[PDB]
């Protein structure tokens, strides 16, 4: 059973900078991404609140 | 670039600087071209789809 | 009292089986699937919906098979709502709990009732020793509306 | 009311191909099959008859449409 929701056009904006707040799950603060044996490091770019890769 | 399809005009060349220019005019895309018909999932707006069927109740 | 009446439109996509009997299917899963089911779009338990009728035609969508279209149907509902002292089946008597028409379930957790009354195990008796299991007050307020089988959380105070 | 009252191929194509997906998901089959199992064939077999409730909206660059039957249409 579908969306069943079409779209009717698409507008090219900028993101406010304050909106995008609220958009951000966490503060990702960790240089090295890469575990010793290859997991996600936490705070890393790959983590487990942005999401499972 | 005297056309009025955003998404069109980026699915060809300079994607980069058509994006730019729509996005720093605000521009709005109406999705009845062939190109923005199929970026978005729609059935494009020409031969077999150009109109409706209305099932009657 | 609970009567209340809701008008409202909804959007209902009947499979193309239900086309020569439409008024047999637009109610056979798509709207006899919450029958007095809590709603929180509106907080309404959907007792039956007593007409279901289309405004005009049905726009079929391009690859889908469905046939979508809309719905003005008038809910029947039974609102017990804050500000509202109702009754409630006494039938078993609890320290967690205690506890109308035979269908709707209340709940009683326990700081909710007079401290100066004090509980035995086989029975608990108010103030002047007045032994009460019947319907009588109960002000509910704090509506649970998730679970499955929901709660109405009466009180007295 | 201005547009050519034949039916388009276009048009052809997407009606069968609507009523055809329509039989698919057990619709009733107002042209008595005879013992076939396409739904296209059988879709075939009612547009011939001219038994197809479906209305083809057609639109006008502009916005406005206007609905015709698929009944009320010269099938070529």
């Given at each position: 059973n579908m969306p069943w929701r079409r779209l009717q056009g698409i507008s090219f904006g900028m993101y406010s900078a304050e909106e995008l707040k609220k958009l951000s799950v966490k503060s990702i603060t960790n240089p090295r991404y890469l575990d010793s044996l290859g997991n996600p490091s936490a705070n890393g770019l790959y983590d487990l609140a942005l999401g499972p890769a | 670039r005297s056309n009025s399809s955003p998404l069109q005009q980026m699915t060809f060349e300079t994607s980069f600087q058509f994006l730019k220019q729509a996005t720093m005019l605000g521009s709005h895309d109406e999705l009845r071209s062939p190109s923005a018909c199929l970026v978005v999932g729609k059935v494009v707006r020409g031969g077999t789809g150009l109109f409706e069927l209305k099932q009657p109740l | 009292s609970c009567l209340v009446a809701g008008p409202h439109q909804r959007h209902i996509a009947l499979s193309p089986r239900y086309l020569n009997r439409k008024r047999t299917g637009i109610?056979?899963?798509?709207?006899?699937?919450?029958?007095?089911?809590?709603?929180?779009?509106?907080?309404?338990?959907?007792?039956?919906?007593?007409?279901?009728?289309?405004?005009?035609?049905?726009?079929?969508?391009?690859?889908?098979?469905?046939?979508?279209?809309?719905?003005?149907?008038?809910?029947?509902?039974?609102?017990?709502?804050?500000?509202?002292?109702?009754?409630?089946?006494?039938?078993?008597?609890?320290?967690?709990?205690?506890?109308?028409?035979?269908?709707?379930?209340?709940?009683?957790?326990?700081?909710?009732?007079?401290?100066?009354?004090?509980?035995?195990?086989?029975?608990?008796?108010?103030?002047?020793?007045?032994?009460?299991?019947?319907?009588?007050?109960?002000?509910?307020?704090?509506?649970?509306?998730?679970?499955?089988?929901?709660?109405?959380?009466?009180?007295?105070? | 009311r201005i547009t050519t009252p034949y039916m388009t191929k276009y048009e052809r194509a997407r009606v069968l191909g609507t009523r055809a997906l329509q039989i698919a998901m057990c619709a009733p089959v107002m042209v008595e099959l005879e013992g076939e199992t396409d739904p296209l064939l059988i879709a075939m077999k009612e547009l011939k008859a001219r038994k197809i409730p479906i209305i083809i909206r057609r639109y006008l660059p502009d916005g406005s449409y206007e609905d015709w039957g698929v009944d009320e249409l010269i099938i070529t």
């Open positions: - | - | 109610r056979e899963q798509l709207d006899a699937e919450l029958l007095r089911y809590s709603e929180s779009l509106l907080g309404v338990p959907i007792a039956y919906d007593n007409i279901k009728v289309v405004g005009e035609l049905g726009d079929i969508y391009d690859d889908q098979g469905h046939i979508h279209l809309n719905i003005e149907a008038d809910f029947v509902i039974f609102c017990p709502e804050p500000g509202q002292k109702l009754m409630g089946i006494v039938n078993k008597v609890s320290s967690s709990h205690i506890g109308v028409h035979g269908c709707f379930n209340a709940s009683i957790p326990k700081p909710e009732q007079l401290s100066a009354e004090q509980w035995q195990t086989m029975e608990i008796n108010m103030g002047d020793e007045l032994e009460f299991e019947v319907f009588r007050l109960d002000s509910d307020a704090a509506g649970v509306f998730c679970i499955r089988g929901k709660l109405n959380i009466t009180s007295l105070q | -």
